[PDB]
Symmetry: C2
Subunit: 343 residues, 2 copies
């Protein structure tokens, strides 16, 4: 129903087209590129239907009156410009993250979407997976889980040579936020979902960050304490083996997710669970060890995501919440690991 236009021939557009496709309330209507030559080839391999119009410019697609909404798979650097130009043309945006090089730029995109009354949603997929429902709640049980104390979050894949050298996520002019923007983002996001999505008191980075010659981050972490007994940590890197964990330590429960970003199988999703856990009298063993739940996801998360993009006309809000923490962490790295209080 909602005519979707893919602005940018990004490799990750191969997965989202599926989302769009599988979303019973959405269809892939338009798609552009710097050269319709590439858009034609992308549309071919990607099994794009025939009615799908092929454009050889971004301006073309933005002025395409038949565009109800857009998915923007462009490098972090083309958001502040192409996002404002998308809304001004009355088109709703599904913006890939990191949303922008800073909250300042994001707000400009938010306001612009507001002035034009359009719906904007970042590209963080996992928060739409069903598992994220029965767990966002698992942490809302003041008994089975209790009062949140701290929450850890990690993520780091292993950028081979070609990646560390050519991928756009190491280029200061393209996806200049590096590991932070591409990976830290997720950790930061979970660190918010565990806390009901409330900005933390302050934010402090750990020393020992790794930036390439151009100064792009390759690895770094940080603690974000709500100063009221709550703290947390994230961790991202382009130099370590694939790992995706969420550690949440509550007063009465403990939650753990070995995946969370892209599950093992798009069909099912699982997470840990533990409450009133203790040892027997002689501390010779655990009396009741943590259990692992599970939920069926008949529709992939990117699918469930796009099937939710239909917001006729929070999302732009929680995006700014993580984008913000994103900057705090980045500001801290260079502002001599200072604590970045968030108002």
């Amino acid at each position: 129903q909602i005519r979707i236009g893919v602005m940018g021939c990004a490799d990750i557009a191969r997965k989202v087209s599926r989302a769009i496709h599988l979303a019973p309330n959405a269809t892939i209507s338009g798609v552009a590129s710097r050269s319709l030559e590439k858009a034609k080839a992308f549309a071919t391999a990607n099994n794009y239907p025939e009615s799908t119009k092929i454009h050889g410019s971004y301006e073309s697609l933005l002025e395409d009156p038949e565009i109800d909404a857009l998915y923007v798979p462009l490098p972090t650097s083309l958001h502040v410009e192409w996002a404002i130009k998308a809304a001004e043309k009355g088109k709703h945006i599904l913006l890939e993250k990191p949303v922008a090089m800073n909250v300042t730029e994001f707000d400009k995109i938010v306001d612009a979407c507001e002035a034009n009354g359009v719906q904007i949603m970042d590209g963080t997929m996992w928060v739409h997976n069903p598992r994220t429902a029965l767990l966002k709640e698992f942490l809302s049980d003041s008994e089975r889980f209790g009062q949140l104390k701290t929450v850890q979050s990690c993520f780091s894949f292993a950028g081979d040579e070609d990646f560390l050298k050519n991928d756009i996520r190491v280029k200061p002019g393209l996806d200049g936020l590096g590991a932070l923007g591409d990976a830290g983002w997720y950790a930061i996001r979970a660190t918010l979902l565990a806390n009901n999505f409330e900005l933390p008191k302050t934010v402090t980075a750990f020393p020992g960050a790794v930036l390439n010659e151009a100064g792009v981050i390759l690895s770094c972490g940080a603690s974000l304490s709500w100063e009221d007994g709550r703290t947390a940590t994230i961790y991202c890197s382009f130099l370590a083996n694939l790992t995706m964990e969420i550690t949440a330590i509550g007063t009465k429960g403990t939650l753990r997710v070995h995946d969370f970003i892209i599950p093992y199988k798009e069909t099912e999703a699982s997470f840990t669970t533990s409450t009133k856990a203790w040892f027997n009298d002689l501390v010779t063993a655990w009396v009741s060890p943590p259990s692992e739940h599970t939920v069926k996801t008949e529709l992939p998360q990117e699918a469930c995501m796009v099937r939710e993009f239909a917001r006729l006309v929070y999302w732009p809000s929680i995006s700014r919440k993580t984008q913000l923490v994103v900057d705090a962490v980045k500001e801290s790295v260079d502002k001599n690991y200072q604590q970045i209080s968030l108002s």
Copy 2:
């Protein structure tokens, strides 16, 4: 054959007592206490052998010529005084962690032990567990793991109101290091262990440390750096649901164990491994999810510990790895608090 005495009828002494005679190269030969009545009750309660000489005093047990070594589950603060005296009476030492209120006091204890040739060791039993040999085995292979980067570790649990108010761990005297010495201790060991026993360059406690009204730590954390990529984190809390684990990750490997301090079952031990993991072309699934391993451990780790601790027959000197794997861990434990009460300074371990 190795006669061991127990100074201080602490509750943790019950578990170690079972470890002592599951030996079979060690036995219970003696037990002491500030009170003979409390020691008389302890010996019989825990089914000690008639042969065990029940001691109604510390000094009395040390001056006992028929006691080869001692297990000292004494409060932290009593260590530097009573451990030393023990070394001075020719008594080897199995000292409970955290070994002391600081490394200076611990150096003395160690130099006292050297001076008498006896062996000293701490109560960190999880390293004697067979699994740990395979954990280090994995972290050692540079092909299925590679160079180390992170190995975060934490330990917490929910202490009842009775604990939070009367346990020796909340007091600033006996075990005055709080959750750091009781819990942070391990997490630090697990990191040092992952980092081939190499201390970090510097230490920087995290913000939001919760100290009581007496300045004793109830929960806290921090990060460590080596100026490579090797960065880790430890977390400890006396007021947060039970949770323990090690999460190490390298260029090619990832290690995971969620019961590294107290195995679910003493019978076996499991650890998960992941080598060069990735996604299918379209990233709709992992090409291969982590691997769960399981090791047989017919002999529980604490007993494996006492078994190793248990020179006097061949003329060998004391093993320096232990007092050294004890000074390193006890050297950093006092690096954290050194930052939690020093304006969050990046303690320079130089």
